[PDB]
Design a protein around this nucleic acid. Structure first.
Ligand code: ZN
Ligand code: ZN
Ligand code: ZN
Lengths: 114, 84, 43, 65, 49, 133, 159, 263, 196, 559, 141, 102
DNA sequence: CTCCTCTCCATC
RNA sequence: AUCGAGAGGAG
């Protein structure tokens, strides 16, 4: 009766884009990205993947309330290297990693019997 | 009767009660478009306005404090200290 | 239903307390919380 | 009321399994244990869906119009 | 499954809850409080069944 | 900006006192007898045991945001195996002509006891600890 | 009984002392006994203690008691409270009970006493005796639905 | 060949039991997550009861139809009903289905899932088939009927995802173990005497080397090698279930990549 | 509720993916928090759990009858020869991360009962509404779109706070508030209200 | 009494409450519905028309909207119906009954209403799902649990009224409470079993986790703290970051039984300037203690800063515990085989002791103690011989419990549990009582008709020899069944008085109050007390602080 | 044939009863440490024996698994929560017309039953499902 | 002015015990400014601790005793709830009277 | 002679 | 409007 609709978990609403970007006040070269309509399925993913890149100082995420799907990824990075790339470069790294995982799995799926 | 501007004990400090009903009593004026007697540095709530009028001691109100024998004392809100 | 058909009330010593002689006539556990606590009993 | 499709906690379709579960209980003498295993039900969530279900529909039907 | 120990009245089932009462024809002794001149009393609720 | 104490210590007991990772290590100083040291060593990522000799440095240098490494291309004062960071809380007169500092390496604790460690072993936030060999 | 007690030297040190704990109250007469310290003898009878040592000794035994009930449960209440309760009892003259016959008849407003227990009868004698009620009490203003002499309505705002 | 490696021990119609090497835990997980919740499927979403003199009530039935498995092989070339521009249904988004059963017999007549009749344009693609894994060839008891009782209705299967309801899951139960002997020391075993004898070694202990007491803790170690096994309800066949996972994951990863560009 | 006076309310609903899960992939239907266990001595609850597991696996009747030679040491052996750890514990993995759980978990079938009292037949708000006749105060129940009684006992807690105006707001505006006319001589309500 | 002094009233709502470990302490998770229903009369002022005219247009059932617009002449314009509800131009000085909005003042209480604390101001946070959500550390003072306790919300209606919540009743102001001059909220279950877990030496959380935790605190200063460990791996101590939540100039001195600025048992608690030095955080530190960090932080920093604190400790330890996690099995109530053997022989020598007093007393040598019957001095001996059997068999149970023992861990943390809870669950349950005496002879000179007459052994007068996991026996069951129930009786009755007492106690002090001369008088003007509390101090700002002028050596005082 | 007789409480007053009719009156002639500790045969006259002691329990309370391992008032709590616990209350619920009637979609018998739970017809018209429960802290919700 | 002294008397001997010369030099080594601050805020700390004219003490005390009253449920003496019932009632008929001679 | 609440039943 | 049961939380 007060329940929120079950499609509000992956659809967006109105005047609600899937990425908000904002500069963190506390630290220099720092950024806090709000993800509408997403969660741990790819919060935890980017964060640990935004960690293997040596040009990053800081990288964390958090679901403020498991009531609404929105997690905030905050990132600070080295002098110069703007985080908007940091995210990109990582977001891509993943694409490849999975892209490879698909074919490799494809190869071995076609070896088996039954 | 009356009690002079002198011979006053009465705590010079603002009672938590006194103060809350000052904030309130101004908020009731500020909520019905009566003029704001300080610069409102970007706040719009008639409660949060009063809190600035008080930080800046610009509330033209007096307290009347009653001593249980039927005597009383007057206290301008510019006169009282706001600690707490 | 099974229980409400087997209920025992008592109107008005210490009558709510589970008594030795209740052993295997009244249920020791089954009685309602507060209000008429223990005064009602189940077989 | 009838065998649930799919098992609440795991997801394995269990609907089809009912009428099956009954025979290799009683056609070829088997204990409810082994019967749940021939039917592919290896997880206990996905075993409890069937071990427990009381088929109340059969008794429902007994009424007439 | 309905084992039925009720009556129907105006549609709604109704249960008669078994009432409790100290029995009759005994015959007991009750040590009575100090500010009572009455020390012991042997009580007996008498009625014909 | 430098290095604040040095010596080679002689561990006399290991203490697995209802902990798996953290041990309490009581030691002794070979050089000058007026010294003993109780220290809390993470025996998981650096084992310490029987009648064992090790070297202990303090320093206080090589503070807003810890970087990662990259230091696979930097200077580290890392010629050591085991190196934790602390705060100093109370400095105590044992009596004398004898002194003793206390340390909280985020709860891993340290008692050092001597004398010549006065104008040397300071007061502040700074204070690392480098064990080795 | 134990007793933590001054040494000449200075340190408070434990010296045990024999106490007699009884099962029956008479205080007019046990203290007047020789052998026993008549500056300490104590009853859990805070009504007897009042008849003997004076209103003011009562105020204490009544606290000591109130306290000792609360404190056997582990609960610590901050003195100023029981010291209020314990006072309101003591202040009229003897021990004014926390019940209808105590506080709820003691020359207060009628509208108030009214809102406690003997509702009508108060209002009755209120009418027969031309009691002019004050409206300085709390309830007397809850009754009248008014901004009552309390925290906020103690004082009064002016220009 | 380039990154994430993958052996497969045992494969089947309903089980993909596979190692997975050279990968981050982070994603190895987020694979399982998407796999479980995010690869789209088809399953009844509207029901139009026509006449129902069963003892199962209307919404009861309309529920189990939900849970029923409907072939979601070619689902990718079907549109989300929300997306498409028709009002309510159209063949491009929605597959309809009819069920009519009527007690014709004395001896309690069932309604299995196999007498759902497709009524809409299949347009050639592979869709909306009650998956039968049943022996006698009639998976899922819908309900049972008496002598003179009927049940007639229309089901309108749509594209959905487990995030929107578990009926739309194609995954059943995904098993997931990493580092069998606890050499990562990520858990701390709860024991009374041995810990060793007190828990049993997982089937996954054969494919990994024991500890040897003389070795001290490997602190710098990370989580490589995850011993997954995917099950399959079977609207999507076992293989794609993992694949469509890697894709839809890849998808949203990329949609967030595009987003930066579209700002 | 369980079967041994472990009354609880859902406080949150999690999907199958944010749930912790055993290495055989089982999500739990229910996470009750192990703070409820040791301050109401409910040891059976736990026992049930362990037998049930074994019943769900052995495909058997769980024998929970009161006075028996049914032991936790008897039950536990049984589910050793089965494949799990003889006291229920199962290594679970967090749901967001998939990182192992630092400490094993108690898991099992456990008869649970869904009792009455569901939120929605309770939820009641009232912002003005139907009054009664006698006293124009708002009317009892939530059955009537009634109002809530700010009974004496709460007023006490309003007097304590020294909330003067606010206790008046409860005791005039919302609820009653009535305009009577009074005498300047007699002092009663004999006044005629010829207003206009 | 029922109508005037406590009225039914409007602008109120009521529902089941549930837990929310990511709400603020002062916040009140209000369901959308209820928020859609209650209304605050706001005015049309240039400072709001914008946000306000919007609401009018929104509709009396899309959330941040409203019903009812009120005008000059003084009439209802009903915004559900009315031909002009998608129009209405607002003229300055008209009121516009609006939906209750995020961050509004509300009075939110649980009943029974037995402090000024089961009764307080809150911050509104409109949410889905029809339960009233509140922070688990506003648990204590309402006396809540989320197992279907209902709670009552009221909404002010005047600006001044709003203020009267916001300034006086605000939950953070009630943090340090007059009753026991100590704070009444604290750290509770999950949080508390976490805050210890996190904090013990052995516990080390590293980069990936630490980075998140840091971010997890909303008041983070963005500086990764330099890690206590930097060597072959870098790690931070549990303590390390928890300390991120601790504000500045906050110091704490504890010292327990074995505490010695080393704390080789990690005893006591030393906190220096927003970072913690040694000592396991638990109930005594983080609880609702007297010396507690909550009692410090509230005095020293303020309420605000402390009402923020609660969150940060939780938001963090909650996170850490989300990924670690802890449970409880029946295995946590098991005891070792040579313990279990020893427990029984501890009862079995105490079984002799009762027998041998009953042996003595039958042979008329049991010396009658002073002022008590022989029969009493028997009764007394056995009951003391049987408690000391369970208490000892209990301590044998406690000692056998390893530190990995969950039950222990909660008991060490002070989250829930006690010594008695171990002792019954693992060793023996002990003697039942019925009105202070061992089980009575209901049947004539016997207990159950399964016994002989004239039997005064433990077995027969209700000593439950077996542990709860062993399982009681029939006699045993019935006996414990007799005692259990004795509780329930007064849970139905040791209440009905305790409510009548409060009712009087209140009514009798009711209208006593400090006046404008620090005197304590009442409605009559009769002084009760010349300064309130005998010193004119509010007990809120009062602390237990030693008086080192008194105890200790005449010598040590000079020196 | 008089192998069982009906005893009322007043006649109870003058009998010797046996809990178990087996290991209660055989010959006295090892002790699996886990089995709870029952006293002894002690007493020699036994007028009549108990059928089974579980039968001292009510109709709500015999639905409890292991009530004997529980803290008494808890049992009691169940005993009042069983009468609020949803399910198949009568097979005819389709035809009866009752102000308020609840039933369970897929009510399962419990997995762990009572020997009394049999004549109670409970495992045939259950009130509750057999859900897998994790007892652990998770999100602290 | 005499209650003023009396009403402070206790707080002062504390103050004295702690801010006495040898200590405020030896044990804790203040500096003219630092000290002068410790002195400065103690006054303004005290000040904030004074009861506000308004504080509705009647209820306040009552609840404060009435609550712990409810926390009571269960060496031969009437204690707890029922004792309170005697005490508040001015129990003429007290169940356990008892002298305690010293 | 405990607060507060929910729900169902029968009536001049 | 009036009566009366059965429940909910403090156990
Ligand atoms: Zn399953
Ligand atoms: Zn379409
Ligand atoms: Zn007149």
């Amino acid at each position: 009766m007060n329940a929120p609709d079950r499609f509000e978990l992956f659809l967006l609403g109105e005047g609600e884009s899937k990425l908000k970007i904002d500069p963190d006040t506390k630290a220099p070269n720092a950024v806090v990205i709000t993800f509408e309509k997403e969660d741990h399925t790819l919060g935890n993913l980017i964060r640990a993947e935004l960690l293997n890149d040596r040009k990053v100082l800081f990288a964390a995420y958090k679901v403020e309330h498991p009531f609404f799907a929105r997690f905030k990824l905050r990132i600070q990075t080295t002098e110069g290297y703007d985080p908007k790339d940091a995210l990109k470069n990582a977001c891509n790294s993943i694409i490849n990693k999975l892209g490879a995982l698909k074919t490799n799995f494809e190869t071995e799926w076609n070896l088996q019997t039954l | 009767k009356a009690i002079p501007k002198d011979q006053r004990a009465t705590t010079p400090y603002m009672t938590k009660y006194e103060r809350a009903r000052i904030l309130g009593t101004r908020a009731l004026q500020i909520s019905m478009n009566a003029p704001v007697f300080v610069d409102l540095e970007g706040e719009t709530d008639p409660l949060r306005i009063a809190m600035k009028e008080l930080a800046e001691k610009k509330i033209p109100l007096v307290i009347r404090r009653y001593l249980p024998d039927g005597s009383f004392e007057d206290w301008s809100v510019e006169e009282l200290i706001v600690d707490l | 239903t099974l229980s409400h058909l087997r209920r025992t009330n008592t109107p008005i010593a210490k009558p709510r307390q589970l008594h030795n002689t209740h052993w295997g006539l009244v249920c020791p556990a089954e009685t309602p919380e507060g209000q008429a606590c223990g005064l009602v009993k189940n077989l | 009321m009838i065998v649930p499709v799919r098992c609440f906690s795991c997801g394995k379709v269990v609907g089809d399994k009912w009428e099956s579960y009954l025979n290799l209980l009683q056609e070829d003498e088997l204990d409810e244990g082994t019967a749940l295993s021939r039917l592919g039900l290896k997880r206990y969530c996905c075993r409890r869906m069937i071990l427990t279900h009381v088929d109340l529909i059969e008794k429902f039907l007994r009424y007439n119009p | 499954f309905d084992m039925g120990g009720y009556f129907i009245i105006n549609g709604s089932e109704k249960v008669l809850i078994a009432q409790e009462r100290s029995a009759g024809n005994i015959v007991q002794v009750f040590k009575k409080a100090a500010p009572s001149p009455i020390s012991h009393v042997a009580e007996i609720r008498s009625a014909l069944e | 900006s430098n290095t604040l104490f040095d010596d080679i210590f002689q561990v006399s007991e290991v203490d697995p006192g209802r902990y798996n990772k953290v041990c309490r290590i009581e030691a002794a100083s070979t050089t000058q007898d007026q010294c003993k040291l109780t220290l809390d060593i993470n025996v998981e990522l650096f084992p310490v045991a029987a009648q064992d000799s090790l070297t202990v440095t303090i320093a206080s240098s090589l503070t807003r945001s810890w970087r990662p490494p990259q230091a696979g291309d930097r200077s580290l004062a890392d010629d050591y195996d085991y190196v934790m960071y602390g705060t100093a809380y109370k400095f105590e007169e044992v009596s004398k002509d004898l002194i003793a500092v206390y340390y909280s390496f985020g709860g891993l604790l340290m008692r050092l006891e001597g004398n010549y460690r006065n104008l040397n072993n300071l007061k502040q936030e700074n204070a690392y600890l480098l064990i080795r060999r | 009984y134990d007793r933590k007690v001054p040494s000449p030297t200075g340190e408070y040190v434990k010296e045990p002392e024999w106490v007699l704990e009884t099962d029956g109250v008479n205080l007019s007469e046990v203290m007047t006994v020789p052998g026993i310290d008549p500056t300490r003898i104590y009853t859990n009878s805070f009504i007897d203690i009042m008849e003997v040592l004076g209103i003011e000794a009562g105020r204490a035994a009544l606290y000591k008691e109130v306290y000792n009930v609360i404190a056997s449960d582990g609960s610590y209440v901050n003195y100023r409270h029981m010291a209020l309760l314990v006072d309101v009892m003591t202040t009229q003259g003897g021990l004014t009970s926390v019940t209808r016959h105590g506080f709820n008849r003691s020359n207060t407003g009628a509208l108030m006493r009214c809102s406690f227990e003997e509702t009508v009868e108060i209002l009755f004698e209120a009418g027969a005796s031309a009691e002019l009620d004050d409206c300085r009490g709390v309830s007397e203003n809850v009754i009248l639905g008014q901004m009552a002499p309390i925290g906020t309505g103690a004082f009064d705002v002016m220009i | 060949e380039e990154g994430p490696q993958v052996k497969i021990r045992e494969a089947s119609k309903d089980n993909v039991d596979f190692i997975l090497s050279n990968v981050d835990l982070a994603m190895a997980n987020s694979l399982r997550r998407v796999m479980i919740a995010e690869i789209p499927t088809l399953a009844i979403d509207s029901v139009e009861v026509e006449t129902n003199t069963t003892v199962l009530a209307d919404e009861f039935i309309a529920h189990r139809l939900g849970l029923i498995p409907l072939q979601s092989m070619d689902i990718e070339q079907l549109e989300y009903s929300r997306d498409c521009f028709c009002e309510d249904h159209c063949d491009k988004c929605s597959v309809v289905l009819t069920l009519q059963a009527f007690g014709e017999s004395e001896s309690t007549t069932n309604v299995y899932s196999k007498d759902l009749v497709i009524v809409s344009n299949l347009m050639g693609r592979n869709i909306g088939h009650p998956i039968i894994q049943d022996k006698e060839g009639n998976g899922v008891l819908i309900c049972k009927l008496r002598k003179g009782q009927e049940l007639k209705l229309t089901c309108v299967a749509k594209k959905g995802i487990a995030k929107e309801h578990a009926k739309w899951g194609p995954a059943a139960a995904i098993e997931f173990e990493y580092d069998p002997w606890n050499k990562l020391k990520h858990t701390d075993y709860w024991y009374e005497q041995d810990s060793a004898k007190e828990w049993p070694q997982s089937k996954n202990c054969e494919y990994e080397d024991p500890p040897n007491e003389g070795d001290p803790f490997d602190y710098k170690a990370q989580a490589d090698t995850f011993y997954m096994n995917v099950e399959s309800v079977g609207s999507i066949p076992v293989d794609q279930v993992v694949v469509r996972g890697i894709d839809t994951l890849q998808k949203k990863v990329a949609s967030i990549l595009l987003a930066l560009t579209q700002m | 509720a369980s079967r041994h006076g472990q009354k609880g309310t859902i406080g949150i609903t999690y999907r199958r993916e944010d749930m912790p899960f055993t290495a055989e992939g089982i999500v739990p239907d229910l996470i009750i928090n192990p703070h409820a266990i040791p301050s109401r001595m409910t040891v059976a609850h736990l026992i049930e759990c362990l037998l049930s597991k074994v019943a769900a696996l052995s495909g058997n009747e769980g024998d929970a009858s009161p006075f028996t030679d049914i032991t936790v040491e008897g039950i536990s052996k049984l589910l050793r020869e089965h494949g799990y750890q003889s006291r229920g514990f199962e290594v679970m993995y967090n749901g967001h991360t998939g990182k192992k759980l630092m400490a094993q978990i108690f898991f099992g079938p456990t008869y649970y009962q869904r009792l009455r009292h569901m939120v929605d037949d309770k939820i009641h708000a009232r912002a003005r509404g139907p009054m009664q006749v006698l006293t124009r105060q708002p009317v009892e129940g939530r059955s009537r779109d009634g109002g809530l009684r700010f009974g004496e006992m709460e007023r006490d807690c309003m007097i304590a706070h020294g909330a003067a105006s606010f206790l008046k707001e409860r005791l005039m505006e919302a609820s009653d508030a009535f305009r009577v006319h009074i005498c300047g001589i007699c002092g009663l309500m004999t006044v005629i209200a010829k207003l206009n | 009494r029922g109508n005037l002094m406590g009225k039914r009233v409007d602008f109120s709502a009521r529902t089941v409450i549930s837990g929310d470990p990511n709400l603020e302490l002062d916040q009140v998770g209000v369901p959308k519905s209820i928020a859609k229903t209650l209304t605050y009369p706001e005015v049309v002022t240039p400072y709001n028309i914008d946000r306000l005219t919007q609401l009018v247009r929104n509709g009396p059932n899309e959330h941040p909207g409203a019903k009812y617009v009120i005008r000059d002449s003084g009439d209802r314009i009903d915004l559900r119906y009315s031909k002009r509800a998608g129009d209405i131009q607002l003229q300055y000085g008209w009121k516009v009954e609006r939906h209750i909005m995020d961050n509004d003042p509300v009075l939110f209480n649980r009943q029974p209403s037995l402090h000024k604390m089961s009764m307080m101001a809150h911050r509104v946070k409109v949410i889905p799902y029809s339960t009233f959500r509140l922070n688990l550390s506003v648990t204590s003072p309402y006396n809540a649990d989320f197992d279907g306790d209902e709670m009552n919300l009221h909404v002010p209606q005047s600006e001044e009224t709003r203020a009267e919540l916001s300034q006086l009743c605000a939950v953070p102001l009630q943090i340090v409470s007059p009753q026991s001059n100590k704070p009444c909220m604290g750290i509770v279950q999950d949080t508390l079993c976490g805050i210890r877990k996190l904090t013990l030496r052995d516990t080390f959380i590293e980069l990936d986790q630490v980075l998140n935790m840091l971010y997890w605190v909303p008041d983070w200063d963005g500086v990764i703290p330099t890690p206590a460990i930097i060597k072959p791996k870098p790690l931070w101590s549990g303590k390390q970051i928890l300390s991120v939540a601790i504000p500045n100039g906050i110091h704490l001195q504890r010292f327990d039984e074995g505490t010695t600025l080393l704390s080789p048992k990690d005893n006591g608690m030393l906190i220096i300037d927003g970072q913690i030095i040694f000592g396991v955080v638990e109930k005594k530190t983080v609880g609702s203690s007297n010396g507690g960090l909550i009692h410090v932080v509230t005095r020293e920093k303020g309420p605000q800063v402390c009402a923020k604190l609660f969150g940060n400790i939780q938001k963090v330890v909650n996170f850490w515990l989300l990924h670690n996690g802890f449970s409880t099995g029946i295995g946590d109530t098991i005891a070792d085989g040579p313990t279990m053997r020893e427990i029984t022989e501890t009862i079995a020598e105490a079984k002799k002791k009762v027998l041998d007093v009953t042996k003595e007393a039958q042979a008329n040598l049991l010396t009658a103690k002073h002022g008590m019957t022989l029969r009493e001095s028997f009764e007394d001996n056995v009951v003391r011989f049987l408690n000391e059997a369970r208490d000892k068999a209990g301590r044998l149970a406690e000692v056998n419990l390893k530190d990995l023992n969950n039950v222990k861990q909660m008991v060490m943390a002070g989250s829930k549990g006690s010594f008695i809870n171990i002792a019954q669950m693992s060793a023996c349950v002990g003697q039942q009582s019925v009105e202070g005496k061992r089980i009575a002879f209901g049947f004539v000179d016997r207990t159950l008709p399964h016994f002989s007459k004239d039997d005064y052994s433990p077995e027969s007068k209700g000593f439950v020899e077996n542990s709860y996991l062993r399982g009681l026996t029939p006699q045993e069951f019935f006996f414990h069944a007799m005692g259990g129930r004795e509780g329930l009786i007064d849970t139905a009755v040791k209440t009905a008085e305790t409510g009548y007492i409060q009712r009087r106690l209140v009514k009798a002090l009711e209208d006593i109050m400090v006046h404008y001369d620090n005197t304590t008088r009442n409605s009559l003007g009769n002084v009760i007390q010349f300064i309130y509390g005998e010193d004119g101090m509010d007990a809120a700002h009062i602390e237990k602080q030693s008086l080192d002028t008194i105890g200790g050596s005449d010598a040590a005082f000079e020196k | 044939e008089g192998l069982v007789e009906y005893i009322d409480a007043e006649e109870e007053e003058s009998i010797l009863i046996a809990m178990q009719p087996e290991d209660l009156e055989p010959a006295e002639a090892d002790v699996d440490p886990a089995k709870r500790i029952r006293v002894s045969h002690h007493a020699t006259t036994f007028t009549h024996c108990e059928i089974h002691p579980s039968m001292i329990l009510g109709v709500a309370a015999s639905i409890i698994p292991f009530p004997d391992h529980n803290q008494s008032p808890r049992n009691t709590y169940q005993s009042a929560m069983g009468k609020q616990a949803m399910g198949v209350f009568l097979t005819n619920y389709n035809v009866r017309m009752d102000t308020m009637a609840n039933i369970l979609y897929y009510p399962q018998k419990p997995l762990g039953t009572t020997r009394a739970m049999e004549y109670l017809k409970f495992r045939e018209l259950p009130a509750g499902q057999n859900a897998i429960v994790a007892i652990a802290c998770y999100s602290g919700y | 002015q005499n209650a003023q002294r009396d009403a402070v008397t206790l707080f002062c001997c504390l103050l004295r015990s702690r801010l006495a010369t040898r200590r405020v030099l030896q044990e804790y080594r203040l500096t003219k400014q630092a000290f002068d601050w410790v002195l400065s805020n103690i006054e303004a700390q005290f000040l904030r601790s004074v009861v506000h004219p308004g504080e509705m003490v009647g209820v306040l005390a009552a609840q404060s005793i009435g609550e712990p009253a409810t926390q009571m449920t269960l060496k031969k003496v009437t204690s707890g709830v029922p004792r309170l019932k005697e005490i508040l009632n001015v129990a003429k008929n007290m169940k356990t009277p008892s002298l305690t001679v010293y």
